[PDB]
Design a binder for this molecule. Structure first.
Ligand SMILES: Nc1nc2c(ncn2[C@@H]2O[C@H](CO)[C@@H](O)[C@H]2O)c(=O)[nH]1
Length: 216
């Protein structure tokens, strides 16, 4: 993948040199987002992600995403921010790369299920709706569980926990099928899960959900 309809070849060359001067090497394109161009690199012997404002996107959109990403980083929901910068008037952020698999492709253990609850309930308590839980590409299952990529996030009544649990336990998809077979989940479990989620929606209580997952 290349970014040539968005940045000149000279701008890309300069950006890689600029990153190299901050110690970030072996930089490779990773994705094109709605707000940003995303790269991976190596800093201090470890993998990092670099997100650069797309010049053809509003700067305010990137700034909103960055503010939300910083809050999520402070509370541990997303991997730590390592540094901020600006190149040719474009802001960028550098964060740790979380080793592991997106939950769409991940082998999910009981500890991961508890951790997914803890992270999504925490983001709910922060009043931040991530916005892209469905599809399983934005929850990383690794040494810890993380949410990534806040381009569609905002301060609004959040759906992070309910969307994650519906995707894993209620909806029929590749993830929920794996989980159902791995944990031998049956119809009674699903009905209790629906009850646990309703309870959470009404009261904010995790008691019923954690009770149910503790039986796995
Ligand atoms: N394992 C891992 N994958 C990532 C990370 N950041 C971005 N990605 C990949 O990029 C995609 C969308 O950003 C994800 O679904 C992953 O494949 C990360 O920190 N860890």
């Amino acid at each position: 993948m290349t970014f040539e309809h968005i940045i000149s070849s000279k701008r890309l060359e300069g950006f890689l040199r600029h990153l190299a001067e901050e110690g970030v090497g072996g930089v490779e394109p990773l994705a094109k987002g709605t707000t940003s161009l995303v790269f991976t690199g190596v800093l201090g012997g470890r993998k990092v992600v670099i997100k650069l404002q797309r010049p053809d996107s509003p700067r305010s959109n990137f700034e909103k995403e960055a503010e939300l990403t910083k809050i999520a980083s402070t509370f541990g929901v997303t991997p730590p921010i390592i540094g901020l910068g600006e190149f040719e008037g474009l802001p960028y952020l550098i964060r740790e790369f979380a080793e592991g698999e997106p939950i769409l492709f991940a082998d999910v253990e009981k500890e991961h299920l508890f951790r997914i609850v803890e992270k999504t309930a925490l983001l709910d308590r922060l009043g931040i709706d991530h916005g892209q839980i469905q599809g399983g590409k934005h929850i990383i299952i690794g040494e810890d569980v993380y949410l990534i990529d806040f381009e569609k996030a905002g301060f609004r009544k959040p759906n992070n926990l309910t969307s994650a649990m519906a995707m894993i336990f209620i909806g029929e998809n590749a993830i929920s099928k794996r989980v159902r077979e791995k944990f031998g989940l049956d119809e009674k479990f699903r009905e209790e899960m629906k009850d646990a989620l309703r309870h959470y929606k009404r009261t904010g209580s995790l008691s019923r959900l954690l009770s149910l997952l503790s039986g796995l």
